[PDB]
Amino acid sequence: MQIFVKTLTGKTITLEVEPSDTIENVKAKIQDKEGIPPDQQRLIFAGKQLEDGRTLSDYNIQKESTLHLVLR
Amino acid sequence: MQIFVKTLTGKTITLEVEPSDTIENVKAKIQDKEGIPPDQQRLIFAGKQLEDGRTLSDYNIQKESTLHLVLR
């Protein structure tokens, strides 16, 4: 199912994410397509700045979700 | 070696720091001295916010260096 991770100035990472998916797994799915390693990926979604080892369900990330990505 | 970790809000935290000091090690010495826990602190040198496990030697933060501490 798709998520739209939006990297700052507009670079929108369309990712196919699993029903099983996890946040370091999603960082690996970004480290593909965008080439960005996990420290340099700081994600933001719904109230929360995100970490590394959590699920997508934890943060309430679902189908057609806009996440934001902060580089650094 | 003596550095001046200021806040923008008036305060100067005068610290004897190491050439081996990483930023969280300086943040731990700020936790000791002024009571502030680690990832509440953000260190600025000049106008750049710092990465974590890099040293004061890497950044060239030597003696008499004024750093600026903000909280977020």
Number of distinct helices of chain A:
2
In N-to-C order, the SSE pattern of chain A is: EEHEEHE
Which range best describes the helical content of chain A: under 10%, 10-25%, 25-40%, 40-55%, 55-70% or over 70%? 10-25%
Strand content of chain A: 35-45%
| Structural class estimated from helices and strands of chain A | alpha+beta
Total domains of chain A, how many?
1
Biggest beta sheet summary of chain A:
5 strands, mixed
Q: What's the gyration radius of chain A in Å?
A: 11 Å
- Cα shape of chain A: globular
**Termini of chain A, distance in Å?**
27 Å
Strand order of the largest sheet of chain A: 2-1-5-3-4
Secondary structure tally: strands of chain A: 5
User: How is the quaternary structure best described?
Assistant: homodimer
What are the key terms here?
homodimer, 72 residues, alpha+beta, five-stranded mixed beta sheet, 21% helix, 36% strand, signaling protein
Describe it for me?
The PDB classes it as signaling protein. The entry lists the keywords diubiquitin, K27-linkage, post-translational modification, signaling protein. The assembly is dimeric. The entry is titled "Representative 1-conformer ensembles of K27-linked Ub2 from RDC data". Chains A, B: Ubiquitin. The first copy, chain A, has 72 residues and is of the alpha+beta class. Chain A has one domain (1-72). Chain A is built from two helices and five strands, in the order E-E-H-E-E-H-E. Chain A has helices at residues 23-33, 56-59, and strands at residues 2-7, 11-16, 41-45, 48-49, 65-71. In chain A, strands 2-1-5-3-4 form a five-stranded mixed β-sheet, covered by helices on one side. In chain A, strand 1 (2-7) and strand 2 (11-16) form a beta hairpin. Chain A is globular. The N and C termini of chain A lie far apart (27 Å). The chains hardly touch.
